[PDB]
Tab-separated table of N, CA and C and ligand atoms in Angstrom:
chain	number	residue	atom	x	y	z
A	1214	UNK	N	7.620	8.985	-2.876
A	1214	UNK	CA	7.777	7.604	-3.388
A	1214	UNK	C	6.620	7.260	-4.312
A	1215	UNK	N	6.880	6.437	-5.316
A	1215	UNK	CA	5.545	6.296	-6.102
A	1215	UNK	C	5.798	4.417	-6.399
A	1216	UNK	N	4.243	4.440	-6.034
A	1216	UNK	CA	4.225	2.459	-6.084
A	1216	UNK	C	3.287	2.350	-7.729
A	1217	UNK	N	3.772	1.144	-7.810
A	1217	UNK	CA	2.590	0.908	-9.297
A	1217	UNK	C	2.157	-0.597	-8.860
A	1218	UNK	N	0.700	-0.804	-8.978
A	1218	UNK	CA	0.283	-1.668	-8.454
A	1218	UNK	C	0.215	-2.721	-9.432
A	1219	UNK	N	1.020	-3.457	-9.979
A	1219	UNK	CA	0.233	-4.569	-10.938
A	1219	UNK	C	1.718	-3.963	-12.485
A	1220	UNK	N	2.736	-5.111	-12.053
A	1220	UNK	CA	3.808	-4.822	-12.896
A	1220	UNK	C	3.432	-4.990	-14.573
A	1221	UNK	N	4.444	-4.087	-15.275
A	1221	UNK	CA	4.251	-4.142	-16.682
A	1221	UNK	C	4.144	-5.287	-17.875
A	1222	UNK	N	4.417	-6.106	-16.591
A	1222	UNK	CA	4.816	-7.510	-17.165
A	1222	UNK	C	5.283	-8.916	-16.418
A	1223	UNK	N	5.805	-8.479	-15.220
A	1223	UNK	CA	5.991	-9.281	-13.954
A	1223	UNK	C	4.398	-9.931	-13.599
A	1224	UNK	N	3.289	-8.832	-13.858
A	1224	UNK	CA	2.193	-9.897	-13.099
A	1224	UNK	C	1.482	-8.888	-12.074
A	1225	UNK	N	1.271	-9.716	-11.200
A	1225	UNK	CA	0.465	-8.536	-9.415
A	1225	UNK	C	1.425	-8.524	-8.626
A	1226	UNK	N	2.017	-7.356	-8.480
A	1226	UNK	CA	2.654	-7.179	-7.715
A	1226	UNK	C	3.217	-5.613	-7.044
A	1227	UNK	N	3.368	-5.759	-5.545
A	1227	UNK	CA	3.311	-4.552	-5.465
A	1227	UNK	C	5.085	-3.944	-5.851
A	1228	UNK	N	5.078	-2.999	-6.412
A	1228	UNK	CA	6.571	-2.766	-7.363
A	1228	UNK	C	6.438	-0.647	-6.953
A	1229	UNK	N	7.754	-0.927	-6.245
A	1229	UNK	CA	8.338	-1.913	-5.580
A	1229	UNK	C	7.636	-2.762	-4.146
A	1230	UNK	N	7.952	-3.236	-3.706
A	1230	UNK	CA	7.320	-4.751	-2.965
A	1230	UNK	C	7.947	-4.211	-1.602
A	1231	UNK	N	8.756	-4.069	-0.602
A	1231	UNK	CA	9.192	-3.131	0.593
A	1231	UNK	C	10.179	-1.905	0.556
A	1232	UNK	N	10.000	-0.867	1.010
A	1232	UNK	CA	11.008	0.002	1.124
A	1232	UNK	C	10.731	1.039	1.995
A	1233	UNK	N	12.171	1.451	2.335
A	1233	UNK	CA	11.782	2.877	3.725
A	1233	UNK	C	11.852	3.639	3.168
A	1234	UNK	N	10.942	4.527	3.988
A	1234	UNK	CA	11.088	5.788	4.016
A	1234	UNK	C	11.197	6.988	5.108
A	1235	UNK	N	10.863	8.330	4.810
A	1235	UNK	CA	11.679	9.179	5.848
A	1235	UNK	C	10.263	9.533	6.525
A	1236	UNK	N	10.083	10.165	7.745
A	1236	UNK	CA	8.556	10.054	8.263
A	1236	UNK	C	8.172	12.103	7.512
A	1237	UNK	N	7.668	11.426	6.370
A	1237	UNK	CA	7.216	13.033	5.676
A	1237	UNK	C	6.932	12.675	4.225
A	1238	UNK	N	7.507	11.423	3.836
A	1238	UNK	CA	7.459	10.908	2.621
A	1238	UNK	C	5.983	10.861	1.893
A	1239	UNK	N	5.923	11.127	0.768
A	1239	UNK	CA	4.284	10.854	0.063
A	1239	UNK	C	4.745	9.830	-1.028
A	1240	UNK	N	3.663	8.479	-0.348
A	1240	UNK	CA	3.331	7.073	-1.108
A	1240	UNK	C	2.572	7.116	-1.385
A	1241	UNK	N	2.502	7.340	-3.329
A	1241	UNK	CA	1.571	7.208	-3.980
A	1241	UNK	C	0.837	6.116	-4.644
A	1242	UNK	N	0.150	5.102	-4.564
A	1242	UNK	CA	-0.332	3.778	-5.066
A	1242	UNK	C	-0.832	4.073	-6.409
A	1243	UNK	N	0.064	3.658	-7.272
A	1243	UNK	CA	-0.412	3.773	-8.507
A	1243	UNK	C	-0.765	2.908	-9.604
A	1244	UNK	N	-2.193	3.085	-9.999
A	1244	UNK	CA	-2.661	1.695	-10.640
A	1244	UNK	C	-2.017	1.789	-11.799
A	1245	UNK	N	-1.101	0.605	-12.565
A	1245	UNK	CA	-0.725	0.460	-13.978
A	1245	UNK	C	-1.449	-0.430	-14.748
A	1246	UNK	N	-1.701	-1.583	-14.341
A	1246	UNK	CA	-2.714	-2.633	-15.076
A	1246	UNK	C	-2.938	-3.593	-14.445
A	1247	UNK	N	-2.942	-4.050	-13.338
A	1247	UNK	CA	-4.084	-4.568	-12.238
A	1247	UNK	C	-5.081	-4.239	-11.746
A	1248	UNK	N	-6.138	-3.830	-12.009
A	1248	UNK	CA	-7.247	-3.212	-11.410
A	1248	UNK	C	-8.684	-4.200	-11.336
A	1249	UNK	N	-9.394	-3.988	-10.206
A	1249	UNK	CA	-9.462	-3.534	-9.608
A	1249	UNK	C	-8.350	-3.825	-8.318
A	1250	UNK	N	-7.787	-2.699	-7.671
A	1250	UNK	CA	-6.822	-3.134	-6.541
A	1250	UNK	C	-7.087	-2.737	-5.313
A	1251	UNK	N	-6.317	-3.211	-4.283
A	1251	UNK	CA	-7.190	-2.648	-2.891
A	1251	UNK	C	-5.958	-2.869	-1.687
A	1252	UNK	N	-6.175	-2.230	-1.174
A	1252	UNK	CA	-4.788	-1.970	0.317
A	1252	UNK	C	-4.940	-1.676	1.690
A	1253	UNK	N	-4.778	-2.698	1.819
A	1253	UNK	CA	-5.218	-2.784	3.820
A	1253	UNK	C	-4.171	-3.043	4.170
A	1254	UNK	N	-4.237	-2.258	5.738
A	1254	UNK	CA	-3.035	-2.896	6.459
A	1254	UNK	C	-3.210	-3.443	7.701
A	1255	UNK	N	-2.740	-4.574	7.584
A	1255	UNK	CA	-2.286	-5.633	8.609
A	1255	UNK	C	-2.332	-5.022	9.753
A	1256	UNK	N	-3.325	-4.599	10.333
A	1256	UNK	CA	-3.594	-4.171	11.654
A	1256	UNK	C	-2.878	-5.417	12.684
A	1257	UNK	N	-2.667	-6.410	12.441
A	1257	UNK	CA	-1.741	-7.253	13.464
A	1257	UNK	C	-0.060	-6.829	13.530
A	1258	UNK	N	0.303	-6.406	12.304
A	1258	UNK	CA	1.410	-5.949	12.561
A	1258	UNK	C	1.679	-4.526	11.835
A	1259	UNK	N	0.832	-3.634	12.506
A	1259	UNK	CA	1.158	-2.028	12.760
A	1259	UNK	C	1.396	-1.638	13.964
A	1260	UNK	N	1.942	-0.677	13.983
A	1260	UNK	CA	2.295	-0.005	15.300
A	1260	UNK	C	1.337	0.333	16.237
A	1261	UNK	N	1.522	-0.210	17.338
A	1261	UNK	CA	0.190	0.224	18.275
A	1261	UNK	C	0.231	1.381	18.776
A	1262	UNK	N	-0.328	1.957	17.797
A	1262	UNK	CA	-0.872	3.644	17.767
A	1262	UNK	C	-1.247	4.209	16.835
A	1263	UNK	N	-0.641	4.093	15.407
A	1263	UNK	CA	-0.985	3.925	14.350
A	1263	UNK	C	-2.354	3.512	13.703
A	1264	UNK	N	-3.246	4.372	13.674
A	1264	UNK	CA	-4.572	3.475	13.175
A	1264	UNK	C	-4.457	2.893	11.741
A	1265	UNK	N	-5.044	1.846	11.514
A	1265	UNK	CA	-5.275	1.064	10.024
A	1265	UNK	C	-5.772	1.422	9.153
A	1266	UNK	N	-6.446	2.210	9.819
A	1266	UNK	CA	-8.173	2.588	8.770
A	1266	UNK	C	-7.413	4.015	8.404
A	1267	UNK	N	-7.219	4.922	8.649
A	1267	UNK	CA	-6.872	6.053	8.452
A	1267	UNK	C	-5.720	5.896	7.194
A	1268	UNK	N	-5.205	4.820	7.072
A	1268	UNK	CA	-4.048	4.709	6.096
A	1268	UNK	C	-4.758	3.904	4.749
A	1269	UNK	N	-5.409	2.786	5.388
A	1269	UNK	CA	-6.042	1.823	4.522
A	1269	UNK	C	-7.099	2.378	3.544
A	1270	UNK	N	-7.032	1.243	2.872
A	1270	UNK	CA	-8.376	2.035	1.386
A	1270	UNK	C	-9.402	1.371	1.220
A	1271	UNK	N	-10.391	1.052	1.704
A	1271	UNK	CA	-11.258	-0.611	1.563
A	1271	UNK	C	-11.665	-0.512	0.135
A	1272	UNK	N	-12.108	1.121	-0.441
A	1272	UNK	CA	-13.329	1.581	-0.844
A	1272	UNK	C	-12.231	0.507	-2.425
A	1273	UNK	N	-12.753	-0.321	-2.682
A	1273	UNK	CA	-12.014	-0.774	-4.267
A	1273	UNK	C	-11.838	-0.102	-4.843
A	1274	UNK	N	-10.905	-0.144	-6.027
A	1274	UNK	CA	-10.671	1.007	-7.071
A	1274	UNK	C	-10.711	0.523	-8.253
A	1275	UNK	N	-11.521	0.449	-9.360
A	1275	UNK	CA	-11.434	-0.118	-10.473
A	1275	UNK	C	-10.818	1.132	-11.987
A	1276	UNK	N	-10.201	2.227	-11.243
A	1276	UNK	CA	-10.311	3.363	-12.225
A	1276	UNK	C	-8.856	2.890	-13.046
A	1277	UNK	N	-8.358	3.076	-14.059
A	1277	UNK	CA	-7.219	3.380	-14.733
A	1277	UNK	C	-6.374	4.576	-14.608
A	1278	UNK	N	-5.318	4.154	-14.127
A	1278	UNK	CA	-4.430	5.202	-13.599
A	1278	UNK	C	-4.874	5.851	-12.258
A	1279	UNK	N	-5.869	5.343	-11.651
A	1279	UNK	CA	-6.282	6.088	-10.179
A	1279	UNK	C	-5.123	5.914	-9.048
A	1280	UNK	N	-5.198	7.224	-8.625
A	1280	UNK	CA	-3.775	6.799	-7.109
A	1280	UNK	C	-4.453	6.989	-5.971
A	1281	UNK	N	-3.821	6.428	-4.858
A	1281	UNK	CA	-4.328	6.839	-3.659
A	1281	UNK	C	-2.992	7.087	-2.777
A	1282	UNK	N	-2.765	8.434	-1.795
A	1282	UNK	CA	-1.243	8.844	-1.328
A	1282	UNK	C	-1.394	8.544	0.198
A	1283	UNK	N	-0.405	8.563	0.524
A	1283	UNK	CA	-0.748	7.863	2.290
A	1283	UNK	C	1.135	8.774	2.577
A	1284	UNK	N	0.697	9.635	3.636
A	1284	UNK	CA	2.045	9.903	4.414
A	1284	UNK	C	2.291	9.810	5.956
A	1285	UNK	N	3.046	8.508	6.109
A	1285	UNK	CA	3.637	7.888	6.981
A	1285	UNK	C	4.127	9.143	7.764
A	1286	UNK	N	4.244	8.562	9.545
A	1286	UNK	CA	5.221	9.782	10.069
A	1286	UNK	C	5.496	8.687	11.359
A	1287	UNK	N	6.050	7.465	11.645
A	1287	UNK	CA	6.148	7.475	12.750
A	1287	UNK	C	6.910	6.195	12.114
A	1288	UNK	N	8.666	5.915	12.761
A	1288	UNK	CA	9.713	5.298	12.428
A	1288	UNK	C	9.042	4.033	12.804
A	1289	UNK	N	9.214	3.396	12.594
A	1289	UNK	CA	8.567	1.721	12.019
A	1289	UNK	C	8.693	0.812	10.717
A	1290	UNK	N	7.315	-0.153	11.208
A	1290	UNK	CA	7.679	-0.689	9.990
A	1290	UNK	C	5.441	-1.167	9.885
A	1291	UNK	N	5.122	-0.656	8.565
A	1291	UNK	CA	3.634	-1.621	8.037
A	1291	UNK	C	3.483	-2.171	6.926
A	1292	UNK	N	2.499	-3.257	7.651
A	1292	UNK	CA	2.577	-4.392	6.961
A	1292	UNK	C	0.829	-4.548	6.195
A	1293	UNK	N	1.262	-3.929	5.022
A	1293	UNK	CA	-0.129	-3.951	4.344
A	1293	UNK	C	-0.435	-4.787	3.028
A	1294	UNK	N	-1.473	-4.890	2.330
A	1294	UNK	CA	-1.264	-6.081	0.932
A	1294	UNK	C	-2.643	-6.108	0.471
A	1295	UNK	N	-2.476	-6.972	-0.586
A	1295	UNK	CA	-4.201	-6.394	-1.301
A	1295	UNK	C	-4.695	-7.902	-0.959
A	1296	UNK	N	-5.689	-7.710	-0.522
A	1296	UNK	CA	-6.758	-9.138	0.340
A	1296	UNK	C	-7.226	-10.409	-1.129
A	1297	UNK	N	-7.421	-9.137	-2.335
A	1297	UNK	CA	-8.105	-9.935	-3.618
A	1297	UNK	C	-6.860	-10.457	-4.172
A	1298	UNK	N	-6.063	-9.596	-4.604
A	1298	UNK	CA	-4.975	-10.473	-5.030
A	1298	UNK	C	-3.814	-11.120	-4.501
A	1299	UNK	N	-4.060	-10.919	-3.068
A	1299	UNK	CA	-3.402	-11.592	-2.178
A	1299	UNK	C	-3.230	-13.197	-2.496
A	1300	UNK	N	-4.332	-14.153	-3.748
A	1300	UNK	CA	-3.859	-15.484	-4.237
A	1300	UNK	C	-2.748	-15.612	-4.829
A	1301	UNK	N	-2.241	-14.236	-5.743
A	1301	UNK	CA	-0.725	-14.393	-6.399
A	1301	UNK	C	0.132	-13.805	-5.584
A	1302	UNK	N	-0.018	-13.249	-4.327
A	1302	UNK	CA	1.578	-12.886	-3.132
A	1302	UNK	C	1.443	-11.233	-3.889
A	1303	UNK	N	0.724	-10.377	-3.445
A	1303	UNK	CA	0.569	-9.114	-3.655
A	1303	UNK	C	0.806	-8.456	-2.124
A	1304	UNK	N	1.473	-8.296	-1.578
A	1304	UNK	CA	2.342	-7.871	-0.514
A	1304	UNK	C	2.937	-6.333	-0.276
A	1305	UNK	N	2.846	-5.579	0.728
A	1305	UNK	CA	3.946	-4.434	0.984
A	1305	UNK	C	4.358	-4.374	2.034
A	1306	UNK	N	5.250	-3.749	2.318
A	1306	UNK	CA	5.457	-3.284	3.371
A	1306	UNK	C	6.662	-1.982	3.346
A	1307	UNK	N	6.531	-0.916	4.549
A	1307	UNK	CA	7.268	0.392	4.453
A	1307	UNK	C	7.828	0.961	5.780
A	1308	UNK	N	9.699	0.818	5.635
A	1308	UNK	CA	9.977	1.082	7.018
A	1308	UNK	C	10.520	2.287	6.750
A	1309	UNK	N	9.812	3.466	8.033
A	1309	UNK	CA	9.812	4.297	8.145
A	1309	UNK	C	10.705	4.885	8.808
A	1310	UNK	N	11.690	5.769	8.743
A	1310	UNK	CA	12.744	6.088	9.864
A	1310	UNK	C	13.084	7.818	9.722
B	610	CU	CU1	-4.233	-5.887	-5.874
């Protein structure tokens, strides 16, 4: 799966904004022209077992075109989003099955 963080023209947003996937899938976060961007997840609503940190990215990213890949393996659903641009509704989430 490949995400682009910060639409071509829509604005901040995560694009696409929710979708499942299969538990093996590689989600790639890909900066297009929002930067600096950043992706935590909602440790209130992850799976309790699932660590946050192991998925999450604190470290900011200000690079052009930088990705960061995260592969899910456990049928669910997380609820992650960028904290800075979280003022314009920069949101994800990925159900896993
Ligand atoms: Cu962002």
């Amino acid at each position: 799966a490949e995400v682009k963080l910060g639409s071509d023209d829509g604005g901040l947003v995560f694009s696409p904004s929710s979708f499942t996937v299969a538990a093996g899938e590689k989600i790639t976060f890909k900066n297009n022209a929002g930067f600096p961007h950043n992706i935590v997840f909602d440790e209130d609503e992850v799976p309790a077992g699932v660590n946050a940190e192991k998925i999450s990215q604190p470290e900011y990213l200000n690079g052009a075109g930088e990705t960061y890949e995260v592969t899910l393996t456990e049928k669910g659903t997380y609820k992650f989003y960028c904290e800075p641009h979280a003022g314009a509704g920069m949101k994800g989430e990925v159900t896993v099955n």
